[PDB]
Ligand binder design. Structure first.
Ligand code: HEM
Length: 440
């Protein structure tokens, strides 16, 4: 006996980690019936490959009436890119002011409506976007972007030296939220205070109902204290700009300014994470594309847009109809909730030649992973920068990587992607040495 092996028979597989997975990926059934799929529950995005579902809708039922599920009601499903683009543009005949996602739209409202940017229309929206325009311009964001790049490169290099890591928790969770609170102007000491306070605010399972409300309350109260320091000292950060500006003739109320600050920490976080996690997974699925990125045969800018188009973390956003509309001969009445499906739109063969090919040098690439029109993502440039920085770090300091355990999906009828991605990273060893002589 020189080298030893395990002894098994028809069983004997021990759990390695907290999961009990055996496969890198799973073949999901491709459904054919339209009525067999319920879009309300998250599970139907994890058990199904909706590729054929979405094209059946995109060719025969562009404006499809989804049936009522459990408690009322049914809703309109919009699949085609041109249709989705057109409805995003209309903030007059449609509104976000009664919610912009399935949960809020089907429940019949958003509690922050008329105050929070995403759920506000008319003059109030126009004014809120204008005061924040300069704060989100490339020029003002350049120091932020530069810091994102430093952080991402450090997190990737450490993950590369480590070799064995869970990409979600060790890299992806560690960029977006710290970026946005930096932009908001919270001190570094107060960051961990915000993180643990938000985690329970967004907890579900299982007097825990109000525990989440109090957690949210405390964040809002803390921001209100940072707001108070508007008069004390303006600081160029978003909190300061919002507290010291006025729209249109009147100053913004404590609740509004503070509620939008919180909307920034909600929106600046998960959706970027999901994109970053998705890119890494997709590179292991399409090695030639990864090779193309690593060997510098495609620009980071172009590659970034393809990763965004591929991931499409926010599967849908929705509106409610104020006045009656007529699309494709069919009637959309007042009160009806419409859902615009970005993930189907970024797979439309009408706009994207060979839609299910992951192509880093794809052009044109006019996706709608961010919105379109008035509600077009405020932090699109940030989302881009965070992906851009990851891609740049990856091609500089790694030669390749591989999925190491069964990845874990997030459960949402609205967002998609992974919460856990075990990877083995193969580091560019000589590149790290160059990073170590300069830094440290
Ligand atoms: C790649 C990641 C991201 C994706 C896929 C994404 C996607 C979107 C989409 C599709 C919308 C339109 C929603 C609607 O029309 O109702 C939107 C809006 C918005 N997003 Fe993002 N976003 C991302 C990153 C960010 C970041 C980093 C921030 C920074 C806080 C952010 C903050 C916002 C805000 C404040 C709005 C509301 C815009 C308005 O009401 O005018 N998002 N996002």
């Amino acid at each position: 006996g020189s080298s030893h092996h395990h002894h098994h028979h028809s069983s004997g597989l021990v759990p390695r980690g907290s999961h009990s997975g055996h496969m890198t990926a799973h073949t999901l059934p491709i459904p054919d019936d339209i009525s067999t799929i319920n879009l309300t529950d998250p599970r139907t995005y994890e058990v199904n490959d909706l590729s054929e579902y979405w094209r059946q809708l995109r060719t025969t039922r562009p404006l499809y009436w989804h049936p009522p599920v459990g408690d009322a009601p049914g809703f309109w499903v919009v699949s085609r890119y041109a249709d989705v683009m057109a409805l995003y543009k209309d903030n007059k005949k449609l509104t976000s002011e009664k919610g912009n996602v399935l949960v809020t739209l089907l429940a019949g409202g958003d509690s922050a409506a008329g105050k929070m940017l995403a759920v506000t229309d008319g003059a109030m929206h126009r004014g809120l976007r204008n005061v924040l325009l300069k704060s989100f311009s490339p020029q003002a964001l350049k120091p932020i972007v530069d810091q994102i790049r430093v952080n991402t490169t450090r997190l990737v290099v450490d993950a590369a030296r480590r070799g064995e890591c869970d990409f979600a928790a060790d890299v992806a969770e560690q960029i977006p939220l710290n970026t946005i609170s930096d932009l908001l102007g919270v001190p570094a000491a107060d960051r961990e205070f915000l993180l643990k306070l938000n985690k329970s605010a967004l907890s579900s399972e299982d007097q825990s109902a109000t525990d989440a409300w109090l957690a949210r309350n405390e964040i809002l109260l803390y921001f209100s204290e940072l707001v108070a320091e508007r008069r004390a000292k303006p600081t160029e950060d978003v909190i300061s700009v919002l507290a010291n500006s006025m729209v249109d003739g009147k100053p913004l109320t404590e609740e509004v300014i503070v509620l939008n600050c919180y909307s920034l920490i909600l929106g600046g976080d998960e959706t970027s994470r999901l994109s970053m996690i998705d890119s890494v997974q997709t590179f292991t699925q399409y090695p030639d594309q990864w090779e193309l990125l690593r060997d510098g045969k495609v620009t980071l800018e172009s590659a970034t847009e393809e990763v965004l188009r591929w991931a499409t973390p926010a599967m849908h956003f929705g509106r409610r109809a104020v006045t009656d509309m007529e699309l494709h001969g069919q009637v959309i009445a007042a009160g009806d909730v419409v859902t615009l499906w970005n993930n189907s739109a970024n797979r439309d063969e009408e706009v994207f030649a060979d839609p299910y090919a992951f192509d880093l040098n794809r052009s044109p690439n006019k996706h709608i992973t961010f919105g379109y029109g008035p509600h077009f993502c405020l932090g699109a440039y940030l989302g881009r920068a965070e992906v851009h920085a990851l891609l740049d770090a990856l091609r500089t300091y790694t030669t390749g990587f591989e999925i190491t355990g069964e990845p874990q999906r997030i459960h949402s009828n609205f967002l998609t992607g992974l919460s856990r991605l075990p990877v083995r990273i193969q580091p560019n060893e000589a590149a790290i040495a160059a990073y170590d002589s300069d830094n440290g």
